[PDB]
Amino acid sequence: KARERPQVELTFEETERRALLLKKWSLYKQQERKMERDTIRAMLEAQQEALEELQLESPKLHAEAIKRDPNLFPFEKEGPHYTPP
Amino acid sequence: SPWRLLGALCLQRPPVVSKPLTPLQEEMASLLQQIEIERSLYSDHELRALDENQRLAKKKADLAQDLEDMWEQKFLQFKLGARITEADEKNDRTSLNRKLDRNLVLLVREKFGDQDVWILPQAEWQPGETLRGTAERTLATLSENNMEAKFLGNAPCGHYTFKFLGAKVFFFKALLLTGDFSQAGNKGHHVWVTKDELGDYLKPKYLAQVRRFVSDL
Amino acid sequence: DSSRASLTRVHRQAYARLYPVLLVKQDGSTIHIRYRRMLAMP
Amino acid sequence: YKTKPTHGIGKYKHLIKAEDYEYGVLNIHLTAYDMTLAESYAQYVHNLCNSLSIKVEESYAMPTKTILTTHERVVQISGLSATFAEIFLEIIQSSLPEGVRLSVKEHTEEDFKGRFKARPELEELLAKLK
RNA sequence: AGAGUGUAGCUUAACACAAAGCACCCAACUUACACUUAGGAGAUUCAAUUGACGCUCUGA
């Protein structure tokens, strides 16, 4: 049921605080996503320029350089711990 | 002109600990915690605590607080690992446990015949030997350890052509899973670099852009 | 940016209150988990 | 009209299809004991691959496993170039919140599920097989 | 050191009454996505067509 805390009454200054927090959060997340977009674009263009230079230097290497590898299929990543073991 | 056949490996270690929070994050964390408290429905612990305490009080007139108390005490009893292990050395570049919240890379100081500069680990690739194979060869030979590295992709993360006989260097990314390093104080000048140290160490303009193909994270 | 993505609001309307408990089985590596203060398994 | 130059001006369903080394369907598995974190990262990986113009088959859920129950969420990912896939997996490993597992086991022929097709789809399929 | 130059991501948008239109992010619904609703952040590199601050390629 919902008899635990049926009453939910808060002040006005807290609403103002909440609004400011949400506005700041929106700005922050926009900035963070901008950083992500910048880094991925930089990485992609780095890949492109390296590959193009490889084409010019050696016509042989790119064939194996674009080739898939089976070992990637069963990949596992270890998540970060709040304390070292 | 014949080209100097060189392949470079870039090794990255995942952060052991999460990055420290911003004031904004923590205040919003408190805000969502408040929201969670507000919008909960019929929590069993609160029924076991508050209402039971009231009933027992009425009965006595004619406990879960203590439970929380000894829970907290035994929580305090159990020692937790220090997040700040960094503070002990603050000067050691040869330590895997230098930084826990950041991504770190190996950098080797070698005295080349024509140049005296920091150089990321290299391999001489023969026509027979693949770039991948030489990457594992780099991991095995000049490291002198039991590093296990996962090779992400054969695609070159970076490439630079530097001239004083053409010279070419190709950088590939590898991810460290599990490894034990013996003889830390070896002849090899190995340095763990987070993000900032590579800029200072790599004085040439060509190498200065290593940061372009490595995530700051 | 682990902590950046760690922040999340609850989407489920019908749920019981959860507490940020710390999980230390035997490894010693603590984890913040929303759960109904220590975790142990034989 | 056929003779007129304005013939086939109202052709519409040539534009819609109501039916290079490419990886198989990556079923990315995210497990955490905290349901909230798993759901969050599922949403994150979804909108990320959406922004990177990567095809998604399904983001379905499977029943919870009893142990302190562990929560699991899967997303189906396809349309990855090798060089692009490299960047993709490094992104998804970097921004991992707290101890959520990443199983990137690919879809196999034996583990195949056929969806309940709609009336137009079945009619189209019948027309083709006729 | 030379050349090419120049509006938030994009646009031979900007005669003017004007720095505009898509992109982008957060919150609600959605397991999700998407739609919708409710909010947020944005720029003419500086001085008089010209000169010098940022960017890309060529020298060691």
Side-chain angles (χ1 to χ4, degrees), chain A, chain B, chain C, chain D residues 1-66 68-130:
Chain A
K1 320 294 179 180
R3 275 89 179 175
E4 194 194 6
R5 273 91 60 179
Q7 60 85 33
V8 271
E9 292 81 7
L10 266 309
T11 66
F12 194 87
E13 63 274 15
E14 69 81 25
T15 65
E16 291 292 305
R17 173 185 54 89
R18 277 178 185 268
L20 259 295
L21 292 183
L22 283 171
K23 188 184 175 181
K24 282 181 279 179
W25 181 251
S26 302
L27 196 142
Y28 165 76
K29 289 304 283 291
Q30 199 189 312
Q31 279 292 141
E32 195 281 324
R33 267 293 311 167
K34 185 213 281 171
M35 296 200 285
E36 286 190 353
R37 203 168 290 104
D38 295 342
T39 190
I40 63 165
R41 182 199 61 254
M43 277 185 79
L44 186 74
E45 73 186 354
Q47 288 287 150
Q48 186 64 49
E49 67 87 32
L51 274 164
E52 286 305 305
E53 283 163 323
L54 199 146
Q55 310 299 126
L56 260 83
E57 281 178 315
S58 61
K60 178 66 201 73
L61 284 181
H62 74 92
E64 63 81 24
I66 62 162
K67 174 61 77 178
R68 284 180 290 159
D69 56 346
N71 60 342
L72 264 188
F73 302 152
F75 157 81
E76 189 63 41
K77 193 265 174 179
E78 174 62 54
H81 295 284
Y82 284 140
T83 51
Chain B
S1 65
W3 294 84
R4 301 167 220 172
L5 317 157
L6 294 165
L9 183 139
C10 188
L11 182 56
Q12 301 299 324
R13 49 136 281 176
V16 183
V17 75
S18 79
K19 285 205 175 290
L21 44 87
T22 195
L24 181 71
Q25 196 188 307
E26 70 81 25
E27 69 190 352
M28 282 210 86
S30 78
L31 188 64
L32 61 89
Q33 186 64 44
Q34 281 292 321
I35 283 297
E36 275 188 30
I37 297 301
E38 278 170 45
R39 75 183 290 176
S40 68
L41 275 95
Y42 258 64
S43 66
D44 188 37
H45 176 261
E46 274 63 20
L47 259 291
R48 186 53 63 184
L50 183 70
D51 296 325
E52 283 292 326
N53 283 353
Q54 289 305 118
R55 280 189 287 270
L56 260 292
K58 297 303 149 292
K59 279 181 179 180
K60 280 168 181 179
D62 304 334
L63 184 62
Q65 291 300 311
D66 60 336
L67 289 174
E68 286 288 330
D69 294 331
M70 91 266 295
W71 282 21
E72 189 265 358
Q73 90 82 32
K74 63 191 170 185
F75 173 78
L76 260 293
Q77 280 295 105
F78 201 93
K79 207 267 175 186
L80 78 150
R83 287 201 192 195
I84 178 71
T85 317
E86 312 171 349
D88 60 4
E89 51 197 5
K90 290 299 290 173
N91 74 323
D92 193 17
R93 301 280 81 87
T94 71
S95 53
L96 166 70
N97 199 8
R98 176 61 195 94
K99 298 279 186 72
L100 290 100
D101 66 318
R102 299 200 76 173
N103 192 3
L104 275 87
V105 62
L106 269 311
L107 185 66
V108 181
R109 188 60 171 92
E110 65 85 29
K111 284 87 189 176
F112 185 69
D114 194 78
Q115 205 175 358
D116 295 323
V117 75
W118 294 81
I119 294 292
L120 213 84
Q122 300 291 337
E124 171 71 47
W125 74 268
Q126 282 89 59
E129 284 191 329
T130 182
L131 269 305
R132 279 220 180 104
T134 57
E136 277 97 32
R137 196 172 55 84
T138 300
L139 290 169
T141 53
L142 57 92
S143 78
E144 296 95 6
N145 50 38
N146 282 47
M147 289 305 110
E148 182 70 79
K150 177 66 188 171
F151 197 79
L152 276 94
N154 46 3
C157 304
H159 169 62
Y160 301 109
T161 304
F162 74 98
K163 288 168 184 283
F164 304 131
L165 189 69
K168 55 174 183 175
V169 60
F170 290 87
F171 298 85
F172 318 108
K173 195 181 178 180
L175 182 67
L176 200 146
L177 293 159
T178 308
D180 287 49
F181 179 43
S182 298
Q183 198 191 358
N186 58 358
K187 58 179 182 286
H189 290 238
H190 67 90
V191 161
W192 288 95
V193 166
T194 69
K195 170 66 198 71
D196 304 323
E197 299 86 11
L198 61 97
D200 310 307
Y201 292 157
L202 301 159
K203 57 178 178 74
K205 54 188 75 67
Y206 275 89
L207 270 302
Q209 281 103 47
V210 159
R211 62 173 65 89
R212 93 184 286 182
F213 65 81
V214 62
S215 182
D216 170 46
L217 171 70
Chain C
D1 50 12
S2 298
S3 62
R4 190 268 306 161
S6 293
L7 192 141
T8 316
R9 298 270 168 172
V10 62
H11 296 139
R12 299 286 82 182
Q13 57 175 46
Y15 76 109
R17 187 200 272 201
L18 295 164
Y19 313 95
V21 303
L22 278 308
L23 187 136
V24 274
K25 193 264 191 183
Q26 205 79 51
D27 55 356
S29 62
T30 210
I31 315 283
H32 272 89
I33 285 160
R34 290 185 188 92
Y35 172 57
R36 183 83 262 155
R37 300 291 175 93
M38 52 87 73
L39 271 311
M41 197 72 180
Chain D
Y1 194 81
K2 279 181 179 189
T3 63
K4 299 285 103 166
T6 53
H7 168 68
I9 198 157
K11 281 188 187 286
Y12 74 88
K13 76 163 73 182
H14 69 267
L15 298 167
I16 63 143
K17 294 304 167 199
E19 291 167 353
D20 58 304
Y21 305 113
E22 182 47 55
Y23 297 85
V25 181
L26 278 100
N27 314 326
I28 187 175
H29 287 67
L30 280 305
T31 193
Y33 292 99
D34 203 320
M35 187 264 283
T36 306
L37 266 305
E39 183 181 63
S40 185
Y41 207 57
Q43 284 184 37
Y44 184 78
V45 72
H46 202 321
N47 64 19
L48 254 287
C49 62
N50 270 335
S51 75
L52 289 195
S53 187
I54 308 163
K55 181 59 77 179
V56 178
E57 285 82 5
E58 211 181 2
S59 63
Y60 74 99
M62 69 301 283
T64 314
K65 298 156 184 178
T66 58
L68 268 303
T69 67
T70 181
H71 294 267
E72 178 60 57
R73 206 60 43 84
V74 71
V75 192
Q76 304 189 42
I77 304 299
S78 183
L80 293 93
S81 183
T83 179
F84 185 76
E86 192 203 57
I87 314 158
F88 175 76
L89 91 127
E90 81 78 32
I91 292 154
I92 63 171
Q93 73 88 22
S94 69
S95 50
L96 182 68
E98 186 70 16
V100 191
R101 301 289 93 170
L102 270 89
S103 180
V104 287
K105 53 158 72 65
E106 280 75 2
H107 168 269
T108 184
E109 203 68 55
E110 66 85 22
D111 183 33
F112 164 76
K113 162 71 181 180
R115 66 177 296 276
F116 194 90
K117 298 176 191 288
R119 290 281 303 274
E121 301 175 30
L122 275 166
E123 207 285 328
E124 186 270 338
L125 210 144
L126 268 175
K128 299 304 147 181
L129 71 86
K130 266 200 86 178

